[PDB]
Paper text:
In order to advance understanding of the specificity of GH149 enzymes, we herein solved X‐ray crystallographic structures of GH149 enzyme Pro_7066 in the absence of substrate and in complex with laminarihexaose (G6). Both enzymes were shown to have substrate specificity for β‐(1 → 3)‐gluco‐oligosaccharides. The domains present within each subunit can be defined as follows: an N‐terminal β‐sandwich (residues 1‐303, yellow), a helical linker region (residues 304‐341, lilac), an (α/α)6 catalytic domain (residues 342‐1045, green) and a C‐terminal jelly roll domain (residues 1046‐1156, red).
X‐ray crystallography was used to determine the structure of Pro_7066: the substrate‐free structure was solved to 2.05 Å resolution. However, useful data could only be obtained from the G6 co‐crystallization, the structure of which was solved to 2.25 Å resolution. The two copies of the molecule in the ASU form a biologically relevant homodimer with an interfacial area of ∼4230 Å2 were calculated by jsPISA. The architecture of the Pro_7066 active site is highly similar to that observed for GH94 enzymes. Bicine (BCN) derived from the crystallization precipitant was bound via hydrogen bonding contacts with R470 and E951, possibly mimicking the interaction of the enzyme active site with the hydroxy groups on C3 and C6 of Glc1P donor. A sulfate molecule was observed (ice blue) occupying a similar position to the phosphate moiety of Glc1P in the PsLBP structure (magenta). In the Pro_7066 structure, Dom 2 (green) is found in proximity to the gate. The average B‐factor of Dom 2 (∼70 Å2) is higher than the average B‐factor of the protein subunit (48 Å2), suggesting Dom 2 is more dynamic compared to the rest of the subunit.
Numbering used by the authors:
A (entry chain A): 19 to 519, 523 to 1156
B (entry chain B): 89 to 409
């Protein structure tokens, strides 16, 4: 019944879900190249607007209420059809006429994701109605309608068609959400008679101030294609028409929801079709409206101009996406489409570069101005043209001999198209698509994002623009604090930290530093070997001044949930430097200079020493910085929780760094004098305890070690918070740093070996406690997917051990059968309501206080039910409510003494009933999102990438084909779980669209901009055998399946680096993709070969599938020298 | 359509299954119907009525209040045709809130709330428990939800129960439902499904009771009552009428009661007076004052005066004089 097919609709290819109304309605984002947003259900219910929720065309509510609003909000169509001497009413897409007709409902979405079609076939009448939503930068939203008579009858049809619950301009989303009824009283909907255009405005902007408040803009809707339409500007007569009566034209309705309906009478002949469109736009002033009214009256080609602007939208969307290697053509369009949408959702969230490596002088100059006024005054940019390259900027910078300009020039990222991922399914996130200037609609080069989200997106983005990697690394490092953390958000201007408003506090996320930095360091060392070495002694890095005071070690040990204070005095000094310098005012100074500068080695030590200072042997990295790691739903693990996850990634980080140091020929390092004691105390602690690694570490020695590491970090930060950096550095041995890295790895490796479970899975998060104030004890938590992802990413296990983990995982309680993928942690039965809160009779009778409270029928703490069972008071949420109630009791004379005597006993009974010591967060206590029985897809896709990396290791090290085969089988199965080949009913949406999660009781939830997409981009490149090493690009698939290759000839339409829309003809036994926006064709052949085609009309061939460094730089550098690459692949190497 | 009262009837007439959904807009102009609305003279009861003129079937439901039991929805299905009908009915209430959701959160973030919902049936009694898995809070701390909203029923024989609206549409399309006793992540509902033969010129009645802010002890008391109290229907009806009587006593103390030739005027005077005393208050008991209340009032007003004045000479109850 519910199938999914490829179907041409008026010459454009769409995916079609047949019988979409047999599915539970699901939520979609319709994407634009411009500033449109549209969040729509498969039932038609929607919100839409431009820029943000404050310019909504339809009201901005949560996705449940959007879905529930389809009958009264958005699209509405009623047809009065004369057949025989009977007037027959048909209302497609409604639930107003249940089972009155045999109907088929179909849903279509195009391959680019920017058009959607709703279709209803009335099988009894042989009539089909379709409407399609499109976007136009110029005109707004365009609803294209088609009524098709495929019967053998002629029908006299009176139709009422349009859109309802149109917002007026200038209602805040908050007011519409909370007080929609009051808003109605200010609505005035009008028709401009000559044009038929509808004006949807307020009589006044609603405001608390006793002042005039004129509403001088409006939302609009207008129409083309119908002869002599009558118009409604409200839904008042809709029901009259529904009941088979005729309507009266409306041109001035006050106090009612806006609507725009067209009414016409037509004779629809057999085997014919009638078409029309409605256009709607937001934020229109008097001038805007007059321009449209004039166009309607005088511009004969206005329909064509609208259609042209729609297609321009598609073309621009393709150009944006194609620049990040979105375009692939294989035998499987589902895979090709998913890659397209993955890439789009990546660049929507993290941004896309404006134009290859090109920079505009004006934007760049303004950026320098905001960053550092001293630098801006001093640097003369005349030698640079109006437009220049990243290379031109590097060369210019190299001549200015100014380290602050070097940093700002390097940090510059000409990104556009990014926006925050808020929507009706993520209503806690505010979104705004700020991609067109409010002044003239020109492009906006800006970005902002949460730390983890944006640095994740950028890892995938860097693949398509490799020469920006240095920029990203410096942005990251230079926005990190001296004590080894970072602010919560980055921007083009710089960075933002959270502030305090309560039970409100700030902090640092434990996962933010190591793994996200590492993926960039790995990238640059593959693309530009030696480049990191060149920064070892280069004092061009800075420290972000985030005004957070991490408390002394003894205070953290005492209460590890109370560990970071906001330093308001430090904040004032920053704000003062910001007025005096610009953004650079948020960098640490030294005693000597305005801005303190350090080298790459010092920046790495800053972050490594901070983590190692929280290293609990055999337990992981202590979570004690008032924020969680990746999983917000286990946020109560902050305090006594310890991350093995971060330790696994730290293993990978330190091995990488160990090799980096080993490949260096520098004999010394140079670091802040202040850091010397810290570095040395940590190194020494590890060196003098290395003898302990021969066995297991006692709880006593665990504390000896942590105390020394923690005290060293605390003395360092106290000194910097109070005295600052004095400005002097000291020369130390490179050998000493290699010794530090080696011993750190010995300790981490020992800790990893202590964290294997009997089932072969690894611990993700552990608990620590301080005992006899002399010991640190470890205890364990449930199996967690995130632990398996991290240990499989660690580089520590052998291929056989990796495969044992994955075999354990497949056989564990994390495998969810119906979706054949992985939970974050086991599903568990929570106690039913009447099983939650019973006190044993024995416990009550043994307590004098509880027994007395029962005797006296006091119900403030305990109550006895009418079958003689005992319960804690129903208002208690946790122990703190119980305590408060016991203090209230202690005010009464007859309870005072007993309360003092037995308070601890009663509290212990409470803890016995509720087991709140085991609480790790809302993860274990709800049923959506990260909750019980829910698949959180980002983590599954992180597993997929880790497994891929495990497959590449086994192939590289020439493991047995049995081990390689079993690891690949895991890879292919995990990929299947991701669900691109599932039926729409099982997936719960279009399987080519990413969603954040799939809960136990529904299909896919939260469409679009999940971080999942960046992982799947990287995995796809790995599958295609795109490897970079030693500065050389290799195109050599080992994991790619034979069935990816075309079975018939197809045309690959792609975009060049210079924005030329071109085509290549593919034959059978080939496929195509792009890399750095060069088209690459794989073809099955008798012999391996690569052929590089250059824009000089020449080509060059070799048997080796590894390109040389210069050719590879020509690819990475996007200079248009290489036109395309063809790679001849052995059938026997395909899977 | 999605919140509150919902009723669907599958009626065997000829060898055809006919679906009728009174008060809905789901079957526009399928039947000739008459809808009537009733409100009592005191304003504390309301009846919704739909006559299906094609079938000679009338459905009514009435909302009443009970201090003891909460809200009481009294249902009547009346066959005034000359036919005998085999009817499978699904009747109840939907989008029942769980206990402990703030009005602010329900207004702004209803979708998040769903992920915390758990609706259960107490099998022996047929009582529905509408709760959260945890009270929703920003703090990283445990947050137990130890109260619930409830609904239960009297008057239908061997009913099947739903605790969600998941299968409502299946029934609407003429299919039979599966019993539910534990639904997670969905809007609460309470539906009864029974099959009955409704003879010509006969009427069937039932009631649904719903209440808020119920703890474990409150729920056990209702489950015990359902199992052991033979006169529970009468006790509910008694408490409803006590409510009317108390309403009249309050209002009458402020001269609400008039009887003229025109009941519209008499009724308007009643409601005027009620809305006046609802907003400004009514005196407790003529000019009578309680020592305890008065003493507490003086204590809060002026501690010096409270310390100085000895109220012993006044009785437990005394007049303004
Ligand atoms: Cl936000
Ligand atoms: Cl973000
Ligand atoms: Cl310096």
């Amino acid at each position: 019944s519910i199938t999914m097919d490829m179907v041409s609709m008026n010459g454009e290819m769409f995916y079609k879900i047949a019988n979409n109304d047999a599915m539970r309605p699901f939520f979609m984002t319709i994407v634009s190249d411009s500033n449109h947003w549209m969040f729509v259900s498969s039932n038609g219910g929607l919100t839409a607007g431009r820029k943000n929720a404050e310019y909504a065309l339809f009201p901005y509510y949560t996705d449940d209420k959007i879905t529930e609003s389809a009958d009264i909000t958005g699209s509405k169509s009623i047809f009065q059809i004369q057949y025989n001497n009977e007037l027959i009413v048909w209302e497609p897409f409604s639930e107003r006429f249940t089972n009155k007709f045999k109907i088929t409902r179909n849903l279509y979405k195009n391959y680019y994701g920017n058009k959607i079609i709703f279709e209803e076939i009335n099988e009894d009448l042989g009539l089909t109605y379709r409407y399609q939503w499109c976007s136009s930068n110029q005109f707004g939203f365009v609803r294209k309608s088609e009524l098709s008579n495929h019967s053998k009858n002629v029908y006299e049809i009176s139709l009422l068609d349009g859109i309802q619950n149109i917002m007026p301009y200038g209602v805040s989303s908050d007011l519409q959400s909370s007080t929609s009824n009051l808003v109605d009283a200010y609505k005035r909907s009008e028709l401009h008679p000559k044009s038929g255009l509808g004006i949807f405005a307020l009589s006044a902007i609603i405001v608390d101030k006793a002042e005039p408040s004129e509403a001088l803009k409006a939302n609009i809707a207008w129409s083309l294609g119908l002869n002599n339409p009558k118009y409604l500007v409200s839904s008042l007569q809709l029901n009259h028409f529904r009941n088979g009566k005729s309507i009266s034209p409306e041109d001035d309705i006050k106090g009612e929801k806006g609507a725009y309906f067209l009414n016409t009478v037509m004779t629809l002949e057999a085997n014919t079709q009638k078409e029309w469109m409605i256009i709607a736009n937001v934020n229109q002033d008097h001038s805007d409206i007059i321009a449209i009214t004039e166009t309607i009256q005088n511009n004969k080609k206005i329909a064509e101009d609208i259609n042209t602007d729609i297609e321009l939208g598609t073309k621009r969307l393709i150009e944006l996406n194609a620049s990040s290697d979105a375009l692939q053509l294989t035998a499987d369009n589902l895979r090709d489409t998913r890659h397209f949408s993955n890439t789009l959702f990546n660049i929507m969230r993290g941004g896309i570069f404006d134009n290859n490596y090109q920079i505009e002088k004006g934007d760049f100059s303004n950026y320098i101005k905001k960053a550092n006024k001293l630098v801006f005054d001093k640097i003369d940019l005349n030698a640079l043209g109006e437009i220049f390259s990243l290379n031109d900027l590097n060369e210019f910078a190299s001549k200015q001999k100014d380290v602050d300009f070097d940093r700002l020039a390097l940090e510059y990222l000409p990104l556009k198209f990014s926006r925050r991922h808020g929507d009706p399914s993520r209503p806690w996130n505010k979104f705004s698509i700020n991609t067109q200037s409010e002044i003239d609609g020109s492009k906006v080069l800006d970005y902002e994002g949460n730390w983890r989200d944006i640095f994740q997106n950028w890892e995938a983005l860097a693949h398509s623009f490799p020469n920006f990697i240095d920029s990203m690394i410096h942005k990251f490092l230079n926005a990190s604090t001296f004590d080894g953390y970072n602010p919560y958000r980055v921007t083009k201007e710089g960075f933002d930290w959270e502030t305090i408003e309560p039970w409100s506090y700030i902090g640092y996320w434990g996962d933010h530093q190591i793994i996200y930095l590492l993926k960039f360091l790995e990238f640059i060392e593959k693309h530009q070997p030696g480049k990191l070495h060149s920064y070892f002694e280069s004092e061009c890095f800075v420290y972000a001044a985030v005004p957070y005071t991490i408390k002394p070690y003894e205070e953290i040990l005492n209460n590890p949930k109370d560990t970071i204070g906001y330093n308001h005095e430090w904040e004032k000094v920053i704000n003062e430097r910001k007025k005096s310098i610009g953004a650079d005012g948020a960098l640490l100074k030294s005693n000597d200079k305005s801005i303190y500068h350090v080298n790459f080695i010092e920046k790495i030590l800053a972050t490594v020493l901070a983590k190692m200072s929280n290293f609990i042997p055999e337990a992981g990295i202590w979570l004690n910085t008032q924020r969680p790691e990746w999983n917000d739903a286990n946020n109560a693990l902050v305090g006594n929780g310890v991350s093995m996850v971060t330790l696994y990634y730290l293993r990978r980080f330190l091995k990488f760094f160990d090799q980096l140091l080993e490949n260096s020929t520098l004999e010394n390092i140079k670091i802040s004098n202040e850091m010397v004691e810290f570095y040395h105390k940590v190194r020494e602690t590890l060196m003098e305890n290395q003898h302990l690694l021969a066995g297991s570490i006692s709880d006593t020695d665990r504390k000896v070690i942590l105390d020394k590491l923690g005290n060293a970090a605390a003395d360092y930060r106290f000194q910097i918070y109070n005295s600052g950096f004095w400005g002097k550095k000291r020369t130390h041995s490179m050998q000493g740093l290699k010794n530090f890295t080696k011993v750190s790895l010995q300790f981490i490796d020992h800790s990893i070996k202590a964290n294997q479970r009997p089932d072969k899975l690894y611990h993700a998060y552990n608990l620590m406690s301080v005992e006899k104030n002399k010991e640190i004890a470890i205890s364990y938590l449930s199996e967690m997917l995130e632990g398996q992802v991290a240990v499989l990413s660690s580089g520590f296990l052998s291929s056989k051990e990796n495969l044992a983990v994955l075999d354990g995982l497949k056989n564990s309680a994390l495998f969810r059968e119906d979706q054949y993928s992985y939970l974050l942690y086991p599903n568990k039965e929570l106690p039913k309501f009447l099983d939650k809160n019973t006190i044993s009779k024995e416990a009550v009778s043994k307590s004098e206080l509880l027994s007395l409270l029962v005797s006296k029928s006091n119900k403030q703490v305990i109550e006895k039910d009418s079958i003689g069972e005992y319960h804690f008071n129903g208002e208690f949420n946790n122990a703190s409510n119980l305590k408060q109630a016991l203090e209230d009791l202690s005010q009464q004379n007859e309870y005072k003494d007993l309360v003092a005597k037995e308070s601890k006993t009663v509290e212990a009974i409470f803890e016995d009933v509720f087991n709140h010591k085991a609480f790790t967060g809302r993860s274990g206590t709800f049923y959506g999102y990260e909750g019980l029985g829910s698949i959180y897809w980002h983590m599954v896709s992180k597993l997929q990438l880790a497994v891929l990396e495990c497959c590449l290791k086994a192939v590289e090290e020439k493991e047995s084909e049995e081990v390689i085969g079993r690891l690949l089988e895991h890879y292919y199965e995990i990929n299947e779980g991701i669900g691109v080949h599932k039926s729409p009913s099982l997936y719960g949406a279009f399987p080519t669209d990413a969603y954040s999660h799939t809960p136990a009781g529904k299909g896919a939830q939260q469409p679009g901009m999940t971080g999942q997409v960046k992982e799947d981009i990287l995995s796809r490149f790995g599958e295609l055998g795109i490897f970079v090493k030693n500065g050389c690009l290799e195109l050599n698939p080992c994991l790619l399946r034979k069935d990816e290759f075309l079975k018939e000839a197809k045309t690959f339409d792609y975009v060049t680096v210079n924005f030329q829309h071109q085509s290549l003809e593919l034959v059978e036994k080939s496929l195509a993709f792009t890399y750095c926006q060069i088209p690459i064709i794989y073809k099955i052949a008798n012999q391996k070969c690569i052929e590089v085609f250059t824009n000089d009309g020449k080509s060059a061939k070799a048997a080796s599938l590894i390109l040389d460094k210069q050719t590879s730089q020509d690819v990475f550098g996007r200079t248009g020298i290489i036109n395309k690459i063809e790679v001849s692949i052995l059938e026997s190497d395909l899977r």
